[PDB]
Amino acid sequence: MKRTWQPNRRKRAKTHGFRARMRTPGGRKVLKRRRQKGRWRLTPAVRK
Amino acid sequence: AVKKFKPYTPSRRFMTVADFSEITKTEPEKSLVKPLKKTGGRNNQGRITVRFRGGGHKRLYRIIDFKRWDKVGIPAKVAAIEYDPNRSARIALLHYVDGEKRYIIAPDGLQVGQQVVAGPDAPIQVGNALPLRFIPVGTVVHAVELEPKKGAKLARAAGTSAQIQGREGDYVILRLPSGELRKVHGECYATVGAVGNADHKNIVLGKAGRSRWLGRRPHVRGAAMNPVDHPHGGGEGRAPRGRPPASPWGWQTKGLKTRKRRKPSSRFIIARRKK
RNA sequence: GAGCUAGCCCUGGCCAGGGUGAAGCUGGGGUGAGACCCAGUGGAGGCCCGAACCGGUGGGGGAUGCAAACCCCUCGGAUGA
RNA sequence: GAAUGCCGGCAUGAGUAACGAUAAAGAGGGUGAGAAUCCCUCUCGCCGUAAGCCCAAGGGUUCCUACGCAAUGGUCGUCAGCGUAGGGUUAGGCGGGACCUAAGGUGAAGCCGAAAGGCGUAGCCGAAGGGCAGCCGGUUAAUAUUCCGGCCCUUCCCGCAGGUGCGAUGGGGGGACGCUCUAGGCUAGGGGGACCGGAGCCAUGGACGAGCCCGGCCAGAAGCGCAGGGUGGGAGGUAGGCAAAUCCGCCUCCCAACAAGCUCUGCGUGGUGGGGAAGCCCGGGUGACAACCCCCCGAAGCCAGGGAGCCAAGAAAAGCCUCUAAGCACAACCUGCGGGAACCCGUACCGCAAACCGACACAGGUGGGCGGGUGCAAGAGCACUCAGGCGCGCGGGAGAACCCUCGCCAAGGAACUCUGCAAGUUGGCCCCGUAACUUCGGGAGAAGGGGUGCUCCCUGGGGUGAUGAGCCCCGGGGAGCCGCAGUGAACAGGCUCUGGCGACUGUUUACCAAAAACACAGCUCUCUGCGAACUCGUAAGAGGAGGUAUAGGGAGCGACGCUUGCCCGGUGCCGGAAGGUCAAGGGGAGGGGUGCAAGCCCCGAACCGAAGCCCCGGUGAACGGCGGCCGUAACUAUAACGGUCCUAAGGUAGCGAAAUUCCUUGUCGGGUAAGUUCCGACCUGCACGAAAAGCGUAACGACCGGAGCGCUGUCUCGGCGAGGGACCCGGUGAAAUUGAACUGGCCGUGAAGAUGCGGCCUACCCGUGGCAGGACGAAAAGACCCCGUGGAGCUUUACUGCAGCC
RNA sequence: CGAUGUCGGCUCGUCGCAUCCUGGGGCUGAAGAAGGUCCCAAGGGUUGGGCUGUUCGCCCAUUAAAGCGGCACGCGAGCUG
RNA sequence: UGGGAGAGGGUGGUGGAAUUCCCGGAGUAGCGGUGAAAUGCGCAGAUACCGGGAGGAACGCCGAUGGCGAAGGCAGCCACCUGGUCCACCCGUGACGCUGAGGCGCGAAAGCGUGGGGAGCAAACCGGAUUAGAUACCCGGGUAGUCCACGCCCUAAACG
RNA sequence: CCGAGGGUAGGGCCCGUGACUGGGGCGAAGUCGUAACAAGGUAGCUGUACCGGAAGGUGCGGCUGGAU
RNA sequence: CGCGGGGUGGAGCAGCCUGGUAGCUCGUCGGGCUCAUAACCCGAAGGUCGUCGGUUCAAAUCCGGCCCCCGCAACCA
Numbered sequence A: 001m002k003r004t005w006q007p008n009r010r011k012r013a014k015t016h017g018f019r020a021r022m023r024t025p026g027g028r029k030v031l032k033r034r035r036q037k038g039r040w041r042l043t044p045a046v047r048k
Numbered sequence B: 001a002v003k004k005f006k007p008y009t010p011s012r013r014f015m016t017v018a019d020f021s022e023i024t025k026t027e028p029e030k031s032l033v034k035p036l037k038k039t040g041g042r043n044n045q046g047r048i049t050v051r052f053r054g055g056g057h058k059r060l061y062r063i064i065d066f067k068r069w070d071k072v073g074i075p076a077k078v079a080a081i082e083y084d085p086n087r088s089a090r091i092a093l094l095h096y097v098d099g100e101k102r103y104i105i106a107p108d109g110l111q112v113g114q115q116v117v118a119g120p121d122a123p124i125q126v127g128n129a130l131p132l133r134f135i136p137v138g139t140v141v142h143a144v145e146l147e148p149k150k151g152a153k154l155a156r157a158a159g160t161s162a163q164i165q166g167r168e169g170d171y172v173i174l175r176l177p178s179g180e181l182r183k184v185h186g187e188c189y190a191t192v193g194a195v196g197n198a199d200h201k202n203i204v205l206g207k208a209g210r211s212r213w214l215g216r217r218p219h220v221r222g223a224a225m226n227p228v229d230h231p232h233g234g235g236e237g238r239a240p241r242g243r244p245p246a247s248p249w250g251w252q253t254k255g256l257k258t259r260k261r262r263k264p265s266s267r268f269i270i271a272r273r274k275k
Numbered sequence C: 001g002a003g004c005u006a007g008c009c010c011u012g013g014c015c016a017g018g019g020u021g022a023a024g025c026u027g028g029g030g031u032g033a034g035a036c037c038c039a040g041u042g043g044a045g046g047c048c049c050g051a052a053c054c055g056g057u058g059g060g061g062g063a064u065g066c067a068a069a070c071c072c073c074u075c076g077g078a079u080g081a
Numbered sequence D: 001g002a003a004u005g006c007c008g009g010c011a012u013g014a015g016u017a018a019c020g021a022u023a024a025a026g027a028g029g030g031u032g033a034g035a036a037u038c039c040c041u042c043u044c045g046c047c048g049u050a051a052g053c054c055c056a057a058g059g060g061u062u063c064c065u066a067c068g069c070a071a072u073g074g075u076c077g078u079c080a081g082c083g084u085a086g087g088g089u090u091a092g093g094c095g096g097g098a099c100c101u102a103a104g105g106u107g108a109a110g111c112c113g114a115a116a117g118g119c120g121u122a123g124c125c126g127a128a129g130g131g132c133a134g135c136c137g138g139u140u141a142a143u144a145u146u147c148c149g150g151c152c153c154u155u156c157c158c159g160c161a162g163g164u165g166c167g168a169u170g171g172g173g174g175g176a177c178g179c180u181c182u183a184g185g186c187u188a189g190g191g192g193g194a195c196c197g198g199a200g201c202c203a204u205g206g207a208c209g210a211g212c213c214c215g216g217c218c219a220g221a222a223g224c225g226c227a228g229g230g231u232g233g234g235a236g237g238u239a240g241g242c243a244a245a246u247c248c249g250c251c252u253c254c255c256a257a258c259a260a261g262c263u264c265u266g267c268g269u270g271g272u273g274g275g276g277a278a279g280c281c282c283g284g285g286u287g288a289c290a291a292c293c294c295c296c297c298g299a300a301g302c303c304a305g306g307g308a309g310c311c312a313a314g315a316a317a318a319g320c321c322u323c324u325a326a327g328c329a330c331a332a333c334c335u336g337c338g339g340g341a342a343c344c345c346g347u348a349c350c351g352c353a354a355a356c357c358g359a360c361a362c363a364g365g366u367g368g369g370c371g372g373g374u375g376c377a378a379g380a381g382c383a384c385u386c387a388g389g390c391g392c393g394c395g396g397g398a399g400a401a402c403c404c405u406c407g408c409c410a411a412g413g414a415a416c417u418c419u420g421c422a423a424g425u426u427g428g429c430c431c432c433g434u435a436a437c438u439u440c441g442g443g444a445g446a447a448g449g450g451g452u453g454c455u456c457c458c459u460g461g462g463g464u465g466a467u468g469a470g471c472c473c474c475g476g477g478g479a480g481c482c483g484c485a486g487u488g489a490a491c492a493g494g495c496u497c498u499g500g501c502g503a504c505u506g507u508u509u510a511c512c513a514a515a516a517a518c519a520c521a522g523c524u525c526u527c528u529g530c531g532a533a534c535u536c537g538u539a540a541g542a543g544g545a546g547g548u549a550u551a552g553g554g555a556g557c558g559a560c561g562c563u564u565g566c567c568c569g570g571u572g573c574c575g576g577a578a579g580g581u582c583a584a585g586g587g588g589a590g591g592g593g594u595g596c597a598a599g600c601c602c603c604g605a606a607c608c609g610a611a612g613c614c615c616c617g618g619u620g621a622a623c624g625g626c627g628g629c630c631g632u633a634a635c636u637a638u639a640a641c642g643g644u645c646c647u648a649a650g651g652u653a654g655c656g657a658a659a660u661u662c663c664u665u666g667u668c669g670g671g672u673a674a675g676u677u678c679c680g681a682c683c684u685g686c687a688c689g690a691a692a693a694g695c696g697u698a699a700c701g702a703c704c705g706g707a708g709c710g711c712u713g714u715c716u717c718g719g720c721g722a723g724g725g726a727c728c729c730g731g732u733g734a735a736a737u738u739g740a741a742c743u744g745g746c747c748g749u750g751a752a753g754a755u756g757c758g759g760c761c762u763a764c765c766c767g768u769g770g771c772a773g774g775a776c777g778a779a780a781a782g783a784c785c786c787c788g789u790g791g792a793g794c795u796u797u798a799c800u801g802c803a804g805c806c
Numbered sequence E: 001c002g003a004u005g006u007c008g009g010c011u012c013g014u015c016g017c018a019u020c021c022u023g024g025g026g027c028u029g030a031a032g033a034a035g036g037u038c039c040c041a042a043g044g045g046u047u048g049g050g051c052u053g054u055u056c057g058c059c060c061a062u063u064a065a066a067g068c069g070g071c072a073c074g075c076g077a078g079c080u081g
Numbered sequence F: 001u002g003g004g005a006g007a008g009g010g011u012g013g014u015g016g017a018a019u020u021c022c023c024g025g026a027g028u029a030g031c032g033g034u035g036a037a038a039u040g041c042g043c044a045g046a047u048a049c050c051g052g053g054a055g056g057a058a059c060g061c062c063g064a065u066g067g068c069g070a071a072g073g074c075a076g077c078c079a080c081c082u083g084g085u086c087c088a089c090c091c092g093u094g095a096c097g098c099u100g101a102g103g104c105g106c107g108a109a110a111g112c113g114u115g116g117g118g119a120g121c122a123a124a125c126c127g128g129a130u131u132a133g134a135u136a137c138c139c140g141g142g143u144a145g146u147c148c149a150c151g152c153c154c155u156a157a158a159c160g
Numbered sequence G: 001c002c003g004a005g006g007g008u009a010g011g012g013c014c015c016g017u018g019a020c021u022g023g024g025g026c027g028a029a030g031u032c033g034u035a036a037c038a039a040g041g042u043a044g045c046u047g048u049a050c051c052g053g054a055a056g057g058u059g060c061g062g063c064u065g066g067a068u
Numbered sequence H: 001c002g003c004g005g006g007g008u009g010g011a012g013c014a015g016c017c018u019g020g021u022a023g024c025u026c027g028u029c030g031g032g033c034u035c036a037u038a039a040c041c042c043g044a045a046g047g048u049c050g051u052c053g054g055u056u057c058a059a060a061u062c063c064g065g066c067c068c069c070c071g072c073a074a075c076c077a
């Protein structure tokens, strides 16, 4: 049947993207949180 | 005079449509329509705040002249009589000798080709607007402002009318279409006559789909729900109310008055509504 | 977290073919004028049969499966909420 | 040494199940250490509204070529979407940007919130919508509307020429719009040709023929031709289009008017440039100087912004045109022409799938366009096929049980069973024919029947063309032929009678319930006068609604027909300026403390003092409620009638063993040979009853009952056959489970059901195909049930709070 | 209670005997035929339907007869539901 | 041709008396109702009085024993439209007549449908009395209905 | 070919019969009230509507075939 | 051998709680009015309180048993 993951690049960038994150306090905390952990990628890779 | 159908399908048994026989121009004036944003009942938070609305036919809002004192003493010809899906009444197109064009609410009796006008000097004839203090007592008006220069607010729906009962100083006394007795200010504009399309109430939608064309979505009885949803939810099998019949939000929905008491309008209501 | 899902908003798209024959209009009869009847025309409808499409009624299979809901036969809707 | 412990290693089941659609394979010849599996050939079979083709999304080198084979690939591997390496994606015109707006998003002005932040006009952003200029062919191993070739076109800059009051984010026009139906003319696409071109072919009994087979086009600027779209002209006045305005709007005259003209498309033709088959011979080369014509069918596509009807009344903004203002008229703009300038990103490949979503090369899921021919009435249905693509990445044998899908069956024909579950039957089209009932539409495909192929003969009307032939579409009559059978294959209703419930079409528990449930048009009550009520929010602000009582909210009932009785004492709700009670506050009789005193400080009676409650009323389509005991009629029985107790009032009409009846398979009738069900009745209704509606009701229902006809492997009662598994051999090779095991029957015993103890009996060692009685067999720390001063959801006249309202 | 699946049907049986039938008996208020009642006896047999989920029971048509009970109310790693 | 009388009919207007309700003043101990009463209403200010307002229905005197119409029926007043009828003249047609199975039209009240209206009245219903009872007569209330528009129904002691 | 009739399928009318049910008629001496006849003790009758154990009552309209 | 409530002139009801005290309506009987009957009017009688046992000076009353009557409950699988 139709499963849950239906990839869509515009949906990915506008939702989880860097610029989406930076616009709310909770989003900036995520980035701060992941720079602290040393994550290689701060944000989902999406090609545009 | 409403049009019936033949039972060639189960829904056509009772479906009744407007006669449309007073309508004379089938597409609206391009200079005077504009997009009507469908809300779906949602508010600026994206929240359903009025339930069971959406999915109706597309529409364009026709801009309706609810002032008229804009143009004191400039006559206008009744150019045509048009359908408007945004209100129960029909609308009448007006070509002013000024050259300008506007829309008003079509009153009962108005004919294509007649001239109408507005202002203190105007004749007491159907379609004319006057400040309320200048219309003789006993005269059936409509499209009445509630306060001076604030816009036609009362008696705007198909068939309705307020009748002037008397005067008192700077204020006159109106019997609204509800039957209440209110004092409305003298300088307030209204329009001689009653709104047209009185047969509106005898329309029988006929099938659920008709209400879906109007944007009216299926309504759900509290009795059909669960107690997380409604005072009337739950029970095993069917069930009577089991408390005073109430809204999904708690308050009681049979007889409980809800006009605010200390309202300033109270000093101006004379008698509560009719029947 | 509404890329699953539920509702709404905006903007697009899709629905083989066949069948039934509402109003109206015309003509004819009717009458004081009518209502109305007849025939033709017309092409209405949460109309009918039925693919696409959307469903999931009954039975069987499957049951460490092809599949964490599938397969076969059958069945519902298919210009409309 | 135990924690269904944690981590890791290795066992067991086991050479077992499986190896992923039953579309299907066989040989020859290559290659190579090695071949059922890679390459070539011929043969077979499968898809063909797809299993072919082209886009979009998503994926991200998977593309091409060389070289490989450890792992990946359910086997094999020489092959590969695998490994290494090299190569490959080319644009002013295609798509997106340098253009426009839509929901929504952001957001100078502004508003609001402890902070973070929430709003918000304009403006900005935002597309798969609007707008904007490229078509045919060739080329590469791999790119092409991108390179090349031919013919076209767009914008910007500069210049020249003619022209004109030029000039805009401002005014106006336009852009600009639904659903159904549909005209005229074309085009795409297709069928036929006795004509045109073509390598050839005569087989096996016949055919040298008007024979067979193949192929008979594509693009193209100006012009011209056809068909359509769009569009009145002139003048006078003018206060409106937030300045102006010669534009637009409005009014008046004149002229025009199905037209014409002007303008814009489509189609045709059109200089020119291309393409061009079967076969044969090794993707090529020939055919070939290829021919490139006639007729018919014909779109849902095109002209198009076409037409008509209808109600539910159908985006915006730019480009474009026009008007003028600041200005400026050495300018500037329009038109024609010439030269120059024209950037950024995408382009490979997969793309109904082995490259996307499903942990897999997974029988599932995935939007758009094209989708040939023949026949079957039609069609995207069905069968067979073209182009094209495949035989599904384990095989070879055997021909047990058993399972799965499938075929047939003597006689019977539901006797099966909870139930005709399942499977038969029926089945398209044409004609005849068709009941109760009904809301007059329906019921209706009712039921029930007859016809259907082929041949010859005469003939009626259409479309094309010409009015004719030819082609194409609808028919009619007559005579005949063959078979078991003529919708000979494939696709394609079993019917009827009668009850319950729901009017109906719809909706729903994604993944055990599709229903009688939800919804639904309709009916009633009630709230709401507009800064509405109500909803969301602390607020600002929003929805309501750019609505206005024929409207909006809330609640119940649920098409429609005939109807909806009695109770207001109790609870809710509505009304009540009196009275009773009632907090803060007012008042301050009178008490107190302290001081030398002046003072400072505390307590405090009467009394004035809201809403709420009490009290007085009204109110049922408001929450709700609608009796008991005894007596009585000239046979009996039963009581129309009486007596009396209580209540706020004692169930009305209709209906009733019911989706409700306990006793109950009540009793009687019907149906059957027989009927705990069914239908009709009766009424001592355990325990119907009137909008949690009462009683009916045509039509409707994958609902749930009962019966009958048809017909059957459901059954008596089973038999045979087919294929895919099961079995054998070669290849690969899991699993839950498992204290260890050297693991028999009885009668006893035992924590009460023993392979394991006692006594007897029986029993050589080890497998393989089968069956399921035991191992209190596996699976899931029982959901039932209790317990815990465990948890959570829900309720209320439980408690105590809070929001909200007064 | 870190699970002993729980009614009835179907299928497949197997045992008890307090025997329904068939065989052998005694007593009879046994004339004959037919019964009644106790005794011996478990070898074999013990039907097809209507109704209901039903076990049972009732009913129809037969029969030599249409027995009762045990096996986890025998039997769901055999099926049904 | 000229004339006349009339609640004949349809539409649209409009006048005053009265009942009820609502507001204001004044005012106080009852009012109402009956055969007698009670229910009911009234110190929360009723009744009775004055002034103001709203709404519906019926039209007093004229009015008659009268008039009009085929019947049912029709009554303030104003205007429009429209019917029937009588009379005078003796002008025109020249038997063009009478009745009438069918048909068609009209048709009091009550009643029904969809809207509207609702003061008074009043089936049903409630309460008070009466009574053996009182599902009545009498009293206090009271919904349909009575009224308008449209559409039905088609009855009668529709009678002279 | 036609054809008595035989079969299958569906209609129409008539008759007899049916659990139960509706009113009707009749029946020397039942029960309950007292509606009507006199002003029958509320004049009656009427069409219709609603209601009630039952006659009946009430409303709306009509008739005198009503009395004083 | 569940929890309720009840038993009293002829009928239906009070009295019980809270001991001394039996009451209401109808019915029944006698008298009236009437031609008569009913209605009506005037008077009367009839209950040892279901039964037995205890407490008590004393029991319809309070407690206990036995009898009878009506009512509610009977659930989880």
Ligand SMILES: [K+]
Residues within 6 Å of the ligand: H076
């Ligand atoms: K339970």
Ligand SMILES: [Mg+2]
Residues within 6 Å of the ligand: A002
């Ligand atoms: Mg889904």
Ligand SMILES: [Mg+2]
Residues within 6 Å of the ligand: A002
């Ligand atoms: Mg889908």
Ligand SMILES: [Mg+2]
Residues within 6 Å of the ligand: A006
């Ligand atoms: Mg999707």
Ligand SMILES: [Mg+2]
Residues within 6 Å of the ligand: A008, A009, A010, A011
């Ligand atoms: Mg995307």
Ligand SMILES: [Mg+2]
Residues within 6 Å of the ligand: A010
């Ligand atoms: Mg996208």
Ligand SMILES: [Mg+2]
Residues within 6 Å of the ligand: A008, A010, A011
């Ligand atoms: Mg997106």
Ligand SMILES: [Mg+2]
Residues within 6 Å of the ligand: A013, A014, A015, A016, A017, A018, A019, A020, A021
């Ligand atoms: Mg973002």
Ligand SMILES: [Mg+2]
Residues within 6 Å of the ligand: A014, A015, A020
């Ligand atoms: Mg976001």
Ligand SMILES: [Mg+2]
Residues within 6 Å of the ligand: A028
């Ligand atoms: Mg920060």
Ligand SMILES: [Mg+2]
Residues within 6 Å of the ligand: A040
């Ligand atoms: Mg790094």
Ligand SMILES: [Mg+2]
Residues within 6 Å of the ligand: A016, A021, A030, A042, A043, A044
């Ligand atoms: Mg993130």
Ligand SMILES: [Mg+2]
Residues within 6 Å of the ligand: B003, B004, B005, B006, B012, B013, B014, B015, B016
């Ligand atoms: Mg209709």
Ligand SMILES: [Mg+2]
Residues within 6 Å of the ligand: B018, B019, B020, B021, B022, B023, B090, B197
């Ligand atoms: Mg109209």
Ligand SMILES: [Mg+2]
Residues within 6 Å of the ligand: B030, B031, B033
């Ligand atoms: Mg606009």
Ligand SMILES: [Mg+2]
Residues within 6 Å of the ligand: B037, B038, B039
């Ligand atoms: Mg909005």
